[PDB]
Amino acid sequence: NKITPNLAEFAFSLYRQLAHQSNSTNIFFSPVSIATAFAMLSLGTKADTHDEILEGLNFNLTEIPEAQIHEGFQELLRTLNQPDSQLQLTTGNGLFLSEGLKLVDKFLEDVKKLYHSEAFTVNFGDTEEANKQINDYVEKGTQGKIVDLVKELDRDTVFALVNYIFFKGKWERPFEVKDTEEEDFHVDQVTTVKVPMMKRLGMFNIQHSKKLSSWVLLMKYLGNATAIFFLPDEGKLQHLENELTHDIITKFLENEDRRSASLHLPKLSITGTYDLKSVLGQLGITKVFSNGADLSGVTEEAPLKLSKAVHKAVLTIDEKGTEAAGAMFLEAIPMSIPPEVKFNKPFVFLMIEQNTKSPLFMGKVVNPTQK
């Protein structure tokens, strides 16, 4: 897991930027899917264009050889696409290139073989039809969960990147639907809204952190992933966001102790849609989106730049995530008063791949029913 510390720093860099833009919008994105897509794209770039991308993903190119970077991403893709996988993770990356371009076979080989991604040729001379084919690809890739992703292409587009990911996990220890009820969610210190709130009494991997001034809950999904929820103390949301570090997360993941608690956790259906040209440009990735881009690994003779780049991530959290009966189990609950831990005010969360400890998702809920 040589690249996991880098992915974690990329997740935090990207989160802190998005959190700076607006503090009153839900956030949800996939550090892994974005980083994988641009590590892949770098295989078609050279010199400064190439270095900017990998440096913008938090790789210090004076310290880590590039071979270890791509080997880390490929080993990560190997775990996320295992056939027998209950994790049910739907992600894709689509490269849409002008059909008039003479493409380098090596790049198309690396895209398909090394990164198991998709590259298409489109007539960008028909802007509306190209837009439709881009949206149809995403819509088909998500069986209709993500529709009308790209809303506008500029006439001069010759190369577009769409990165999508949809996740609805199945809890190893699920909630009972009968126990879900409408509860208050404190959007601020004097204001509440009603939201569907799951609840369960059980033995949870839960603790209060003095360092983070937050409750920290870890819940495992069927498959190879764990959700980490951070509930900041009154007035500590910003402190929480500032103090998160990869080392702090690792310590939580290594703790397996469980304690009784009465957990209240909102059902969630949230999405995040980001213009990666804008967002990654704030992290230093600019030349690949500019006329000066060195994409000679993609096409040798003609100029090229990445004109459009979008990420959309969709999250569903509910009681079971499936209609099938799960494996039954019994937890031994002591008779002492369980703490009441209610995720009923803004909180942060992170989903981690158990094998690599990579950050599959990161987000913030400011209002579950915001839209």
Q: How far apart are CA 161 and CA 119, in angstroms?
A: 9
| Contact flag: residue 269 with ligand H3B (CB under 6 A) | no
Nearer to ligand H3B, 102 or 371 (CB): 371
Q: Does residue 57 bind ligand H3B (CB under 6 A)?
A: no
Chain residue whose CB lies nearest ligand H3B: 370
For residue 272, the minimal CB distance to ligand H3B (Å) is 15
Beta strands in the chain (DSSP E): 27-29, 89-98, 118-122, 159-168, 181-188, 191-209, 214-221, 225-232, 259-266, 268-275, 308-317, 340-342, 347-353, 359-365
Between 114 and 193, CB nearer to ligand H3B: 193
Query: How many Cβ atoms are within 10 Å of 76's Cβ, its own excluded?
Result: 23
226 makes contact with ligand H3B (CB under 6 A): no
Pick the closer one to ligand H3B by CB: 238 or 370. Answer: 370
Q: How far is the CB of 265 from ligand H3B (least distance, A)?
A: 19
Which of left, alpha, beta for 284 (phi over 0: left; psi -120 to 50: alpha)? left
Near ligand H3B by CB under 6 A: residue from 64, 193, 283, 302: 193
Looking at beta carbons only, is 155 or 371 nearer to ligand H3B?
371
CB of 270 to ligand H3B, least distance (A): 12
Q: Does 344 bind ligand H3B (CB under 6 A)?
A: no
Output the smallest distance, CB 191 to ligand H3B, in A: 6
Q: Which stretch binds ligand H3B (CB under 6 A): 186-194, 211-219, 302-310, 347-355?
A: 186-194
Tokens coding 262: 């009465």
Q: Does 22 bind ligand H3B (CB under 6 A)?
A: no
CA distance 272 to 91: 14
| Total residues interacting with ligand H3B, rule: CB under 6 A | 6
How far apart, in whole angstroms, are the C-alpha atoms of residue 296 and residue 304?
8
Distances (CA, A) of 234 to 89, 168, 237, 242, 345: 34, 30, 8, 15, 9
For position 367 contacting ligand H3B by CB under 6 A, the verdict is: yes
Burial label for 250, CB within 10 Å (0-12, 13-18, 19+), is: middle
Give 229's contacts (C-beta < 8 A, 6+ positions apart). 215, 216, 217, 218, 219, 265, 343, 347, 348, 349
Q: Is 187 in the site for ligand H3B (CB under 6 A)?
A: yes
Complex with ligand H3B: residue 196 or 326, whichever CB lies closer: 196
Report the interface residues with ligand H3B, using CB under 6 A. 187, 191, 193, 367, 370-371
